[PDB]
Design a binder for these strands. Structure first.
Ligand SMILES: [Zn+2]
Ligand SMILES: [Zn+2]
Lengths: 430, 427
DNA sequence: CGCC
DNA sequence: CGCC
């Protein structure tokens, strides 16, 4: 006797009582107010979904994979305690996302605070412990057969990775369990958001996850235990990689969608000094420092968009006038694309310095109106098959300009070509 | 070649440039921030959709059907102007919705101001005219061949209805055009949200609108030009009505979803005196009076939920703590259901008085625990073809959820339905 | 009662 | 450039 939540992707999702008492907290329900695809909704109107229902799907998928593993191979000693912590890990892996998901830690906090190293996964670890303490979950955890001190750290390890054996939460015989929720070397997170995102985007999904689950086993490579699929399933995995490619080309890397993300990020930056969120002890925080106090971060969601847009505050009129140009669909303009040469990749610490480098370049022929750094938006688009074990351009740089007259736009495209020449990046096309 | 919006229900939606220039206004994009099912999202997580994408679907379908009618029967004199005005009517039928959709005008405003008579359709008319003047749409209309005065009133009439022939926007040789956007109860708006809601709820819809449009035509019935389908497709409509029945019993009238709607309304009522929305000329409005100025109403959306939830103001803690019991899933509890069979139905004007009645009734059998009116919620759920070859439910919830309060509440409910001659509640 |  |  356990609770059921109806889901359009997975149908009925049965929830162990302990999962229910993690979901029914303000820290988890927070995910109802953060859109999964960020500003992609302003391009795909079917993409209204938030991290909340996605994380229900990931928790469900995680639990159905290891319970299927434990029933096909009982020799692997998979307690139902192990299933409860894998389910909790999938449920909370996204707890640390901020407004508009990957826009927040992928762009905004790099540009507002290049010094800090911040990821949503660290956010999830912090928010997970804030969730556990504020709602008295540690007693409820042992009541359902979990050992909190070792099992909370097991949960945290599944979300954020390691600190021979780097993991303290599970022994090395249960190594396979760490490949389920987030495998950073195919995980149940991409299973859900591949199906969910195409459902809302109108893209077809030819990956069948339930057919991957039923024929999946744990095999041995390296003397290490891994999750492995049948030779009969390579056609399915060719499909998994194809829809991942179409989701990226068509949605995640959409040209208009990515510009709008950087427009929202611009409005946050110009609002960052004047917006206050009350955290612990009345301490007031800002959008960029809310990540330092979880009580404030809990109230940092996509709501900050509408609060800026609905504001009367005169100090917020630069930010408010950017969000208002999104409604009028007068956006930054697409100058061009380029990719870093070799395996070299740009780093978040240097994002802020990118528009100043482009303005400093000297093009071949002079034009009267000259551009400064603030006329440029430099957009760094990162994406992140034979590592799959059976048995029987990763970075894009796009440049936009906030000037939309034809003479500014030509000039902007001659500071982009020179910048590429200077850094020896691939030459832009048309 | 024109702008294209990819939609999960309809695929590609081509939009006339004029439609693009009303969509890309703050008054229309406002619908991105109003959930289609209101609080149903707190029960069905797939139901994250908003009025914006629904209204895109209605403008598309409206133009599809009218273009199909003019293509099969050119005798009917259907110009571009008529289809552009039918499309605009479909796009803007829902402009007047408030936070959480039907909750706002169906419950909140009756309880916050039982005096005034308000509907979202009157809102859509008011907001449509605010959209047109603030965004300089009247010249753009002229550009594409529209006559503003008669074509704007034609659009308003399609939304909210008229004031022999009651309509001033089109003659009766074009009588059929008023049957498309809002109606029999078969309009292109219910086609979209049946498909859209079932897509996001996981309910299955096998009603085919695309072939109902293809075999539809206008016909003569009792002195009148009306839209008609082949008697061939009674089978298509039997399925449409089944999915309407499924969406109502399973989703629209869900017991917990409706309880949460009345919890959100309760927090709105307790926040209504302390929330300020700035309208035209800096003039400040409240949640219940923002409907009086469209410049303020533009900024009244579901965001107001999170403004209450994230507030520090001490005057907003009664409201904030109701929304906090939604997050903790400690909700009002279901006491019972009844119907006024055989009786004058409850009216929005009487809504406020209903809890005081329930708490004033008390059976021949007394018990120790005794409730007051604010401990009760009274929820009034209202339900509301030519071919060619339970009206009202009242549910009662209690805000005290201990076993002894709930037992009493169920004995004030059983005796309030004998006092009102409503049907006896069953178990 | 995020199962009608 | 809410079509890739
Ligand atoms: Zn995820
Ligand atoms: Zn509608």
């Amino acid at each position: 006797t356990m609770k059921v939540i109806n889901d359009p992707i997975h149908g009925h999702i049965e929830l162990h009582p302990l999962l229910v008492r993690i979901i029914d907290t303000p820290q988890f329900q927070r995910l109802r107010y953060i859109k999964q695809l960020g500003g992609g909704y302003y391009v795909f109107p079917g993409a209204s979904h938030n991290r909340f229902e996605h994380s229900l799907g990931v928790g469900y998928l995680a639990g159905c994979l290891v319970h299927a593993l434990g029933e096909k191979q009982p020799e692997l000693q998979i307690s139902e305690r192990d299933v409860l912590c894998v389910q909790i890990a999938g449920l909370c892996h996204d707890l640390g996302h901020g407004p508009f998901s990957h826009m927040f830690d992928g762009r905004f906090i790099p540009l507002a605070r290049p010094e800090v190293k911040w990821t949503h996964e660290q956010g999830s670890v912090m928010m997970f412990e804030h969730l556990i303490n504020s709602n008295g979950i540690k007693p409820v955890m042992e009541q359902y057969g979990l050992i909190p001190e070792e099992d909370i750290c097991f949960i945290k390890e599944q979300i954020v990775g390691p600190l021979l054996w780097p993991y303290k939460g599970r022994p090395e015989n249960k190594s396979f369990l760490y490949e389920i929720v987030s495998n950073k070397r195919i995980d149940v997170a991409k299973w859900d958001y591949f199906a969910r995102d195409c459902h809302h985007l109108g893209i077809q999904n030819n990956f069948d996850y339930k057919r991957f689950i039923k024929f999946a086993r744990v095999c041995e490579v390296d003397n290490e235990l891994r999750i492995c699929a049948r030779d009969k399933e390579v056609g399915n995995l060719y499909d998994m990689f194809h829809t991942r490619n179409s989701l990226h080309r068509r949605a995640y890397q959409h040209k208009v969608g990515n510009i709008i993300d950087t427009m929202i990020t611009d409005a946050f930056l110009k609002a960052d000094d004047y917006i206050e969120i009350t955290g612990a002890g009345g301490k007031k925080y800002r959008i960029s420092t809310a990540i330092d106090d979880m009580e404030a971060y809990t109230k940092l969601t996509d709501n900050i968009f509408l609060e800026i847009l609905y504001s009367t505050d005169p100090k917020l009129k630069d930010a408010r006038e950017i969000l208002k140009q999104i409604e009028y669909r007068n956006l930054f303009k697409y100058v061009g694309e380029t990719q870093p040469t070799g395996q070299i990749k740009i780093k978040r610490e240097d994002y802020e310095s990118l528009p100043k480098e482009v303005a400093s370049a000297k093009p071949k022929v002079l034009l009267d109106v000259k551009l400064k750094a603030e006329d440029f938006i430099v957009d760094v688009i990162n994406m992140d098959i034979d590592h799959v074990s059976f048995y029987c351009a990763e970075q894009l740089i796009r440049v936009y300009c906030k000037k939309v007259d034809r003479k500014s736009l030509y000039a902007a495209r001659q500071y982009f070509v020179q910048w590429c020449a200077d850094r020896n990046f691939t030459k832009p096309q048309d």
